[PDB]
Symmetry: C2
């Protein structure tokens, strides 16, 4: 059901790392005004790892309050402990989130059956639309297409964020699912392709700085207009690359800082974008017409 | 300083998943009488990921209690949040742990400088010996030898658990450090080699089921007796492979259950060793003289 450009919103912070509430509010309003179709609160780009339990909740509550039902809000509720994921997901349901996004448990490397049981348990514990999220390079585990297809059979699992950036594999997943659940790109570089091939949207990092342009890219790609999709994506294509010169969200938070939208706060172990990457980033933003 | 066979103890659990305190006490006593030189409490193998804050504290407390100062106790206190790592490490210090083991932040992929700032902040916040731990395959990040050498200059950072299983790389690290801090193997398959090349010990998984044998392997390897280390390691070499047929600690917990030392409890997302691997594992244990 949720389709289009789905921004993986950063969590603005003060210089001392405290959550920058006013700046977050402005961002949410700007996204809605700019055409962003949905927001993922407190996901990887939002530094879920370094926010406390209370902050995780405050941020979700704030984004929901400011969005005021204008666009669906997806809450990042993944954890590498099934017990904890259930807790976070329930909190999200209770706060009024429209769906929850759950990255596969990271670092502890569960088996494929373990991943199946992990998500099955959460789906059965919380009546809320759940989106799976696979990003092996970060987690140490790869949720296979086969496992994803099995999970698509479970009530409440309505989709998967495929951040592999492996298009053939993504197309294979889409074809095997045959509409059973949605597929979202989790790789800005190839998102336009995956959507042309059947993905329902892009849970984007780039949409953080070019929400209007990415909104348009998703729209025409979903419409299966290959020429337009390719033409519009080319305009923001270098951005998809430069926003990962250092681990996301380091570059994207700096980009927004250069845009005058947020301050420099970011929590250890993450660090402000290294100096050698700032000019190139500023150039890229000027080139794409952002600043 | 802490040298020899250092077991990354499992956290015994009842069938419902609750911590099996009685089995834990027996295990600790068994390790002390069998020759184990030190215990890492609530590390990876001890399912740190699925234990709550309180259970974490209690497991460390119980292990410290039963050991009764007979062998040093290392507390696993890693987290992908610097603030959390500090709180966990301070807690371990207060409980009387001898040192703390901290895996590199996983999932959020900090930069090398971020890894440096992460550990420095912890070292400056807590007066306790700290042991770094690198295991890229699980974390999504690789703490380079260069970064490790820099960190060795920080007061209170006294060692690194190298789980790369890359012997030439480990040797390069040992030589560059020239004693500034200790290097421990984090790969049972190659541990004997790394210790012959200068590592201070092996923070092992295999030691969970063959504590006496591993204590001997470490002793002779530390003594630089190459033939004895090869001969003794050869007898348990197959165990080093089989204990990873599925993600650790899944196999080693089943191994201990077959040995009648612990029950089947293990927390989702982890699952009991898949049925098809149980006979093969039993045979490996029989071949090695363990059961």
């Amino acid at each position: 059901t949720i389709q289009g450009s789905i921004v993986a919103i950063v969590t603005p912070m003060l210089k001392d790392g405290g959550v920058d509430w006013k700046s977050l509010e402005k961002l949410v309003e700007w996204h809605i005004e700019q055409g962003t179709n949905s927001i993922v609160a407190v996901g990887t780009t939002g530094e879920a790892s370094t926010l406390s339990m209370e902050e995780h909740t405050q941020v979700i509550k704030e984004i929901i309050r400011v969005a005021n039902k204008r666009i669906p809000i997806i809450a990042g509720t993944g954890a590498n402990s099934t017990r904890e994921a259930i807790e976070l997901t329930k909190a999200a349901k209770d706060l009024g989130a429209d769906a929850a996004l759950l990255v596969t448990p990271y670092y502890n490397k569960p088996t494929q059956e373990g991943l199946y049981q992990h998500y099955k348990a959460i789906a059965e514990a919380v009546e809320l639309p759940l989106i799976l999220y696979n990003v092996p390079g970060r987690t140490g585990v790869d949720l296979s297409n086969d496992t994803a297809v099995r999970l698509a059979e479970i009530p409440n699992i309505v989709g998967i964020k495929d951040a592999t950036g492996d298009v053939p594999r993504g197309k294979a997943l889409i074809d095997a699912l045959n509409g059973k659940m949605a597929v979202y790109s989790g790789d800005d570089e190839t998102a336009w392709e995956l959507m042309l091939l059947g993905a329902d949207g892009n849970i984007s990092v780039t949409a953080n700085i070019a929400p209007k342009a990415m909104s348009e890219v998703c729209a025409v790609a979903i419409a299966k207009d290959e020429q337009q999709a390719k033409t519009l994506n080319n305009k923001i294509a270098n951005l998809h690359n430069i926003l990962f010169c250092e681990s996301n969200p380091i570059p994207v938070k700096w980009a927004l800082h250069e845009m005058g939208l947020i301050d420099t706060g970011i929590r250890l172990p993450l660090t402000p974008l290294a100096e050698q990457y700032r000019e190139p980033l500023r150039n890229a933003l000027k080139d794409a017409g952002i600043i």
